[PDB]
Design a protein around this ligand. Sequence first.
Ligand SMILES: *[C@@H]1O[C@H](CO[C@H]2O[C@@H](C)[C@@H](O)[C@@H](O)[C@@H]2O)[C@@H](O[C@@H]2O[C@H](CO)[C@@H](O[C@@H]3O[C@H](CO[C@H]4O[C@H](CO)[C@@H](O)[C@H](O)[C@@H]4O[C@@H]4O[C@H](CO)[C@@H](O[C@@H]5O[C@H](CO)[C@H](O)[C@H](O)[C@H]5O)[C@H](O)[C@H]4NC(C)=O)[C@@H](O)[C@H](O[C@H]4O[C@H](CO)[C@@H](O)[C@H](O[C@@H]5O[C@H](CO)[C@@H](O)[C@H](O)[C@H]5NC(C)=O)[C@@H]4O)[C@@H]3O)[C@H](O)[C@H]2NC(C)=O)[C@H](O)[C@H]1NC(C)=O
Ligand SMILES: *[C@@H]1O[C@H](CO[C@@H]2O[C@@H](C)[C@@H](O)[C@@H](O)[C@@H]2O)[C@@H](O[C@@H]2O[C@H](CO)[C@@H](O[C@@H]3O[C@H](CO[C@H]4O[C@H](CO)[C@@H](O)[C@H](O)[C@@H]4O[C@@H]4O[C@H](CO)[C@@H](O)[C@H](O)[C@H]4NC(C)=O)[C@@H](O)[C@H](O[C@H]4O[C@H](CO)[C@@H](O)[C@H](O)[C@@H]4O)[C@@H]3O)[C@H](O)[C@H]2NC(C)=O)[C@H](O)[C@H]1NC(C)=O
Lengths: 207, 208
Amino acid sequence: PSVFLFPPKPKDTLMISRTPEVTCVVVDVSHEDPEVKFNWYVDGVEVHNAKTKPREEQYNSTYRVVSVLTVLHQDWLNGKEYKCKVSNKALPAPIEKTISKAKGQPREPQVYTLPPSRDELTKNQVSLTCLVKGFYPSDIAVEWESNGQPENNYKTTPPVLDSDGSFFLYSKLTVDKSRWQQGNVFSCSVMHEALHNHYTQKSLSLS
Amino acid sequence: GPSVFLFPPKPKDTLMISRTPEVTCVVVDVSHEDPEVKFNWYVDGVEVHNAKTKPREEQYNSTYRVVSVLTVLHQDWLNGKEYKCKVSNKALPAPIEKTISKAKGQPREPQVYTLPPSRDELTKNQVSLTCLVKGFYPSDIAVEWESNGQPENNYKTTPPVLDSDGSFFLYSKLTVDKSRWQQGNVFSCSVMHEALHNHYTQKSLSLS
Ligand SMILES: *[C@@H]1O[C@H](CO[C@H]2O[C@@H](C)[C@@H](O)[C@@H](O)[C@@H]2O)[C@@H](O[C@@H]2O[C@H](CO)[C@@H](O[C@@H]3O[C@H](CO[C@H]4O[C@H](CO)[C@@H](O)[C@H](O)[C@@H]4O[C@@H]4O[C@H](CO)[C@@H](O[C@@H]5O[C@H](CO)[C@H](O)[C@H](O)[C@H]5O)[C@H](O)[C@H]4NC(C)=O)[C@@H](O)[C@H](O[C@H]4O[C@H](CO)[C@@H](O)[C@H](O[C@@H]5O[C@H](CO)[C@@H](O)[C@H](O)[C@H]5NC(C)=O)[C@@H]4O)[C@@H]3O)[C@H](O)[C@H]2NC(C)=O)[C@H](O)[C@H]1NC(C)=O
Ligand SMILES: *[C@@H]1O[C@H](CO[C@@H]2O[C@@H](C)[C@@H](O)[C@@H](O)[C@@H]2O)[C@@H](O[C@@H]2O[C@H](CO)[C@@H](O[C@@H]3O[C@H](CO[C@H]4O[C@H](CO)[C@@H](O)[C@H](O)[C@@H]4O[C@@H]4O[C@H](CO)[C@@H](O)[C@H](O)[C@H]4NC(C)=O)[C@@H](O)[C@H](O[C@H]4O[C@H](CO)[C@@H](O)[C@H](O)[C@@H]4O)[C@@H]3O)[C@H](O)[C@H]2NC(C)=O)[C@H](O)[C@H]1NC(C)=O
């Protein structure tokens, strides 16, 4: 019997219209001892909002029990602590797990778009690059668009700790060479708490 | 009870015959009651006898740690042989077996591209030189930067990322003083991977 606690998605905390949530997952619940119990706290003050999702019977004859707590955007971004407490018959003592946003002064990301290398122009597809550096903490969302429509053939690296204590990442969008050569505009969109309106975009085109 | 961890060789050690690649079997949580541990090693299921076992080390939590190292042949690892470490201890009901090998699949040659700093970044005192490596399989790779034949210090590389075609990509970022870039120095990104000729390639970047 083990307990894991998961933070909300960055995009959910940065847009007021979306619903962020903390997730508490209990694994390795035996058939002999069901009836896992959940206690949730926020800065020590107990809350009663959580919902217990239906459990799954797994392939190795165990169960996974999930509890979800909805959180306010300003609570999470202010640094409040969330504690999940799990009690089962098989456990000797209740298990406590805690999570919160990383502490420290937030730092604004710098966004740079880089066109394909000239050597890549011999291929059928080319890579468009979006470098995002200098940001803190590491919670961030990156998306690509063109003509106001989302592009989907992109992949983003995990954040990497840089030598000055900030984070950086790269996002790579793959497009057909003919779309690049015709002059279409491609945009890298970045969402982070230290940005004005939590959002900025940078464009790239051959022109 | 004891736990067993098996570690692969470092990518640079398998790619240069002058270096020595090694597989490491590490056993933790050996009790003070039953400290005797036995190792058996197999390569493709055939037992080998040239492994080197270090003396047990007492930890501050009243347990022992034991390490056994097997030196491997470069061609054996690159040909996909499987290495098994088996650990026997009287506190166990059965021996513990762990297996490791190179990732399965056909190797694919990396494409290496260097990208100069963005124009918007030239207002800064430091600039970023970018090395993109894409299309490679498997993900075991080594990336380094140098200038004028001497290694550069201030770079960081992302972990490999699985792309949409089943191959991997990564980026490496070198941070340099703007003055060094604007004076026409040559910077070079070097890459080591099994699918490259001589396991090595290099690509340069300069103002010009
Ligand atoms: C019997 O079967 C059990 C279950 O069946 C599964 O078995 C598996 C082996 C597998 O084969 C499956 O086929 C099968 O279904 C099985 O139980 C295992 O146990 C594993 C460990 O023993 C456990 O692995 C851990 O996984 C977590 C992360 O798990 C998430 O990611 C995986 C993919 O990596 C997903 O598959 C999984 O479903 C989890 O999903 C994430 O969580 C939620 C819900 O999905 C998402 O969050 C929400 O998402 C919604 C949208 O869906 C909203 O967005 C919402 O807002 C969100 O909140 C989240 O997005 C999901 N993520 C992804 C990517 O999808 C890892 O964290 C573990 O890694 C640990 O590694 C080290 C080494 O131990 C640990 O030290 C470390 O711990 C912490 O690390 C911190 C670092 O900062 C540190 O600060 C802490 O101190 C430290 N703490 C401790 C105590 O160390 C990491 O935690 C680990 O890999 C499996 O997940 C689990 N199965 C399942 C299904 O969960 C049994 O093992 C098996 N055998 C037996 C004998 O019983
Ligand atoms: C008693 O104490 C032991 C020693 O710990 C010391 O004392 C305690 C009090 C602490 O202060 C420690 O910090 C201190 O070191 C404990 O041993 C540890 O046990 C845990 C498991 O219980 C081991 O965790 C496993 O670690 C794997 C990676 O380990 C590498 O990296 C470590 C740093 O991150 C490093 O310390 C290790 O030595 C090891 O280093 C590699 O060694 C090889 C060969 O020598 C080299 O080739 C590599 O280059 C080295 N790498 C680096 C980065 O240097 C993890 O991979 C592993 O996770 C895997 O399995 C888990 C499931 O268990 C999966 O969830 C996961 O996804 C992954 O697949 C696992 O976490 C730890 O390594 C042990 N420490 C040492 C030093 O051996 C005892 O646990 C403790 N016992 C009790 C009862 O308290």
